[PDB]
Design a protein around this ligand. Structure first.
Ligand code: HEM
Ligand SMILES: CCCCCCCCCCCCO[C@@H]1O[C@H](CO)[C@@H](O[C@H]2O[C@H](CO)[C@@H](O)[C@H](O)[C@H]2O)[C@H](O)[C@H]1O
Length: 444
């Protein structure tokens, strides 16, 4: 035999995210076999859990029973060394607490004026009338807004173009092959590795300058991460870790929020949906303005229930992450069944939120379904943001970002969907509406 230079058997599960959106295939298997079933690929067992009952083992178990490490291995060379899914549990859990602190109610209270100002300025630059790719526009606004709230005023105001380009290069580094072989030495991965080091060099300058002026307070996630302490350690996080936590929140928060922001508009301003649901949403904006005035405050955004439900219903019908997945560390029972050590378990928010028994007329747009649904006591029915221990920590931020966007648009423009509702684009790990995603707008 000629020389064998390497022999690899990678974890296959993360591959589902780049399988071109096999929802109808998995739906067909659900309708035949029921709420728990297994596919084998190269002898690796992939076990699916559909609907609230089957969700319980997935969302109610913890790190000792279900592991994120294998599913999120792709992220380790993106976020950097000893960051989140590249850290041991002891450090990981502490880092997730620092992120929780940066996205708390208190933190959001301070971010909201910054979100509102970026949105108002952004849409104030629009022509009197025209046609816009809402997905391209909202991706632009959402990276501007995150550069301010996550990274702080220095980077937003001086280095936006530089930091946006570094992020773009990390985004371009995540290929299908990347989830099987995160360390494969290809050009896209070399560019990724250089872009991450370049970002660390950029944050090192801001951090060093902030510590040289420790009286100067900052309303950003960077300040929370600079103040952060590991238990029984006086030394702060190093620059690589602080930078890694930023990149993690860009990956968590950018495409998810911009695709959900985009579907919110494309669905609501579709001719039939617009006739039914727009009047209520416009009425709500008037009632909000009568009670609170014109300032978009935390308090006023929190009262926009009908707009909130329009976002939630876009997320129900077109979740940006088709799968969440865990490696099974400890076997468990679900009803009559046994799920063995070594299985990969999946929940598809896409599948689970088209279950008729949970969501009647699941393929119909009906944001007012959530008046009744929000009263239901049964856990894990709506799983757009996941659930349980590793449930989305950005949920409240996401709702404030998207409701701010559509508040500013609804108050200032008449909007129509151009042509047919876009179909989902299943080419990346975040699913969004296929370009072109055109809305026609006219100032009021
Ligand atoms: C509409 C937009 C969003 C959706 C649909 C979404 C969805 C999700 C989902 C499904 C998870 C669970 C992942 C898993 O179980 O493995 C999650 C986790 C998370 N999301 Fe979001 N997310 C959104 C926006 C954001 C934003 C804006 C941020 C940050 C600003 C963010 C930060 C996170 C974090 C930190 C986690 C990790 C929780 C953990 O591992 O403990 N998300 N997100
Ligand atoms: C603290 C823990 C953090 C948890 C981390 C969670 C990670 C979340 C994974 C996000 C992965 C994003 O994946 C990203 O998807 C978007 C599209 O949506 C792609 O975006 C790019 O390609 C797509 C098509 O492929 C285009 O439509 C898009 O306009 C373009 O900019 C990126 O090329 C891809 O990298």
């Amino acid at each position: 035999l000629p020389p064998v230079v390497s022999s690899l058997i990678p974890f296959v599960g993360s591959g589902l995210s780049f399988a071109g959106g096999p929802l109808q295939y998995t739906t067909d298997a659900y309708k035949k076999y029921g709420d728990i079933f297994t596919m084998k690929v190269f002898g690796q067992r992939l076990t699916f859990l559909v609907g609230p009952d089957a969700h319980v083992p997935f969302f109610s178990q913890g790190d000792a029973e279900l592991s994120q490490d294998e599913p999120y291995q792709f992220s380790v060379p993106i976020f950097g060394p000893n960051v989140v899914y590249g850290a041991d549990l002891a450090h990981r859990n502490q880092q997730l607490k620092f992120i929780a602190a940066s996205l708390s109610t208190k933190a959001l209270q301070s971010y909201v004026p910054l979100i509102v100002k970026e949105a108002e300025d952004f849409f104030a630059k629009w022509d009197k009338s025209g046609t816009v790719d809402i997905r391209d526009a909202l991706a632009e606004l959402i990276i501007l807004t995150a550069s301010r709230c996550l990274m702080g005023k220095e980077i937003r105001e001086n280095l936006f173009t530089e930091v946006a380009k570094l992020y773009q290069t990390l985004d371009e580094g995540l290929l299908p092959i990347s989830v099987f072989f995160p360390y494969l030495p290809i050009p896209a991965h070399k560019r990724r590795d250089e872009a991450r080091l370049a970002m660390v060099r950029m944050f090192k300058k801001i951090i060093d300058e902030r510590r040289a002026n420790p009286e100067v307070k900052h309303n950003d996630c960077l300040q929370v991460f600079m103040d952060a302490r590991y238990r029984g350690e006086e030394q702060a996080l190093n620059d690589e870790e602080i930078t890694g936590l930023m990149i993690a929140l860009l990956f968590a928060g950018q495409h998810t929020s911009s695709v959900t922001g985009s579907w919110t508009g494309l669905l609501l301003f579709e001719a039939n949906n617009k006739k039914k649901f727009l009047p209520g949403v416009l009425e709500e904006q008037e009632e909000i303005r009568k009670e609170f005035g014109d300032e978009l405050t935390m308090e006023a955004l929190n009262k926009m229930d009908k707009l909130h439900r329009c976002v939630k219903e876009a997320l129900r019908m077109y979740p940006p992450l088709l799968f969440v997945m865990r490696k099974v560390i400890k076997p468990f029972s679900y009803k009559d069944y046994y799920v063995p050590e070594g299985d990969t378990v999946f929940v598809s928010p896409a599948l689970s939120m088209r279950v008729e028994e949970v969501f009647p007329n699941a393929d119909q747009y009906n944001p007012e379904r959530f008046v009744e649904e929000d009263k239901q006591a049964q856990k894990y029915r709506f799983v757009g943001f996941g659930a349980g221990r590793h449930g989305c920590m950005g949920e409240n931020f996401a709702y404030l970002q998207i409701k701010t966007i559509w508040s500013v648009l609804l108050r200032n423009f008449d909007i129509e969907l151009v042509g047919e509702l876009p179909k989902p684009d299943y080419t990346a790990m975040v699913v969004g509406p296929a370009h072109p995603c055109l809305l026609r707008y006219t100032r009021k």
